[PDB]
């Protein structure tokens, strides 16, 4: 059995890639190992994500599913008492990922992507060229594809399989995130009751509060890996650590709150995988690159890469050799992702200066677009340059 495109995984990257490939008239199979709906962390969307969601015809459905509108994000430093607000670029939402991912997958089915509940386990190769995959599903099946798209997220299938490059981890910023859902959290005053709230103390010590339904808020406490394994060891203790040590806002807001279900812990390690394109295959989303979620780029970038990949895939299915089209995708992805990574690094090194710089109308407006996810067409902007130069200056002097 043959498809133009086989996609591993139906998170936001895989779903959007499938939809876009269908719009280009390609045949598409998506293999997803989990039954939807399924829990997934990563709840606060960018302005650009909202635009894609609107373009998919889902705006009214987002509201009806009870996903709060997101007016922007408040960043509060507990140690310095510096706080700044970044208004949203365009209308968007805070989501419960189980329901959200289900709604998007449904759109991909409406677009005619064929789905299988199954686990991809291997690739099929013709020399160095990838030409299909094996998946389980109580039998091992074989499928043939002109392009195998890895949208496996954090599972990073093609990297683990040795087809894509090795995972390059950013060791200096390794964190562990611990989170749970609560009811009864005290929200800010309308019209900003459903802003995302970020509270931070020391470098790489921070917490989020994200409203995800009419009465439910997502709480995360994120701390360096070493601190976690020394003082906490489990998510309940890490959250309590943040309550006690990151910000008095937490105790205040959570005074009458009640936890819903159990807490979980998860690695928050930045990484990139290179190469992430090759003959007959490519990675999109977290399957090749993960940024610090303090600025919530993940879902937005996953969707953007799925969309841009479809353009490359269409060129190869139409007859082109893989290199020019895939290297164009690669270069475009690296461009945007590096700007986002620089913004995050710049913030962590100079969080107060970052705040003071928002008082500058020109920078402020660029940062609004950048935090909105518009990092992929920035030739001639001032901010990306400032970030890059600062980071290089900081590094060269250490
Ligand atoms: C602590 C934390 C907080 C975060 N907060 C935010 C936030 O506020 N906003 C935001 O935008 N992002 C956030 N993120 C990031 C966000 O969750 C990811 O960037 C996003 O899920 C990436 O989408 P994806 O499609 O690439 O992968 P995923 O969404 O993970 O989807 C991948 C899919 O592939 C399937 N799969 C995996 N392996 C296989 C296989 N072998 N065969 C078949 N199927 C497979 C999985 O079941 C899964 O459904 C956060 C992440 C973390 C860790």
3-state secondary structure of 34: coil
| CATH code, domain with 208 | 3.50.50.60
To one decimal, the resolution in angstroms is: 1.9
Q: At what angle do helices 97-110 and 12-23 cross, to 10 degrees?
A: 20
Domain that holds residue 136: 1-398
Distance from Cα 152 to the centre of ligand 1, integer Å? 8
Ligand 1 atom 35 nearest Cα:
9
Contact 251, 243 (CB under 8 A): yes
| Long-range interactions of 386-395: CB distance < 8 A, separation 24+ | 386/346, 387/339, 387/342, 387/343, 387/345, 387/346, 388/342, 390/346, 390/349, 390/350, 391/342, 391/345, 391/346, 391/349, 394/349
Q: 298 CB under 6 A from ligand 1?
A: yes
Write out the two tokens for 175.
Answer: 């964190």
Kindly report the protein residue whose alpha carbon is nearest to atom 31 of ligand 1: 11
Total domains, the chain:
1
Determine the distance separating the centroid of ligand 1 and the alpha carbon of 302, expressed in angstroms. 8
CA of residue 194 to ligand 1 center, whole Å: 23
**Coil, helix or strand at residue 32:** strand
Q: How far is CA 117 from CA 21, 34, 140, 331, in A?
A: 20, 7, 12, 33
Sorted by sequence, the CB contacts under 8 Å of residue 235 that are 6+ apart come out as: 178, 179, 180, 263, 264, 265
Q: Is 235 in the pocket of ligand 1 (CB under 6 A)?
A: no
- Partnered with residue 8 across adjacent β-strands are 31, 150
């Amino acid at each position: 059995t043959h498809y133009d495109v086989v996609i591993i995984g139906s998170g936001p990257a895989g779903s959007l890639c499938g939809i876009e490939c269908r719009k280009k008239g390609l045949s598409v199979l998506c293999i997803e190992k989990e039954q939807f709906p399924r829990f997934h962390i990563g709840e606060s969307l960018t302005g650009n994500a909202g635009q894609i969601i609107r373009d998919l015809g889902l705006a009214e459905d987002m509201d009806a599913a009870g996903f709060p509108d997101k007016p922007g994000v408040n960043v509060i430093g507990s140690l310095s008492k510096n706080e700044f607000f970044i208004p949203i670029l365009a209308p968007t939402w805070q989501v419960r990922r189980s329901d959200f991912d289900d709604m998007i997958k449904r759109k991909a089915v409406e677009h005619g992507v064929e789905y299988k509940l199954g686990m991809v386990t291997d690739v099929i190769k013709d020399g160095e060229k990838v030409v299909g995959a094996l998946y389980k599903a109580g039998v091992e099946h074989q499928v043939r594809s002109k392009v195998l798209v890895d949208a496996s997220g954090q599972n990073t299938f093609l990297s683990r399989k040795g087809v894509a490059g090795k995972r390059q981890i950013e060791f200096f910023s390794q964190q562990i995130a611990s989170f749970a859902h609560y009811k009864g959290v005290e929200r800010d005053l309308p019209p900003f009751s459903t802003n995302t709230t970020i509270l931070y103390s020391k470098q790489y010590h921070w917490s989020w509060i994200i409203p995800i339904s009419p009465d439910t808020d997502s709480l995360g406490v994120v701390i360096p890996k070493d601190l976690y394994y020394k003082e906490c060891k489990n998510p309940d203790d890490a959250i309590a650590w943040g309550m006690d040590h990151i910000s008095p806002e937490l105790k205040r807001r959570f005074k009458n709150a009640e936890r819903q279900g159990d807490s979980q812990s998860m690695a928050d390690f930045s990484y990139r995988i290179e190469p992430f394109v090759g003959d007959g295959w490519m990675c999109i989303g977290d399957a090749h690159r993960f940024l610090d979620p303090i600025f919530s780029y993940g879902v937005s970038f996953a969707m953007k890469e799925g969309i841009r990949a479809a353009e490359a895939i269409a060129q190869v299915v139409a007859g082109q050799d893989w290199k020019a089209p895939f290297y164009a995708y690669r270069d475009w992805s690296n461009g945007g992702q590096q700007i986002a990574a620089d913004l995050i690094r710049y913030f962590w090194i100079y969080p107060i200066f970052f705040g003071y710089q928002m008082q500058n109308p020109d920078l402020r407006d660029e940062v609004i677009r950048l935090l909105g996810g518009c990092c992929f067409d920035c030739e001639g902007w001032k901010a990306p340059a400032i970030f890059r130069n600062a980071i290089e200056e900081y590094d060269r002097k250490q």
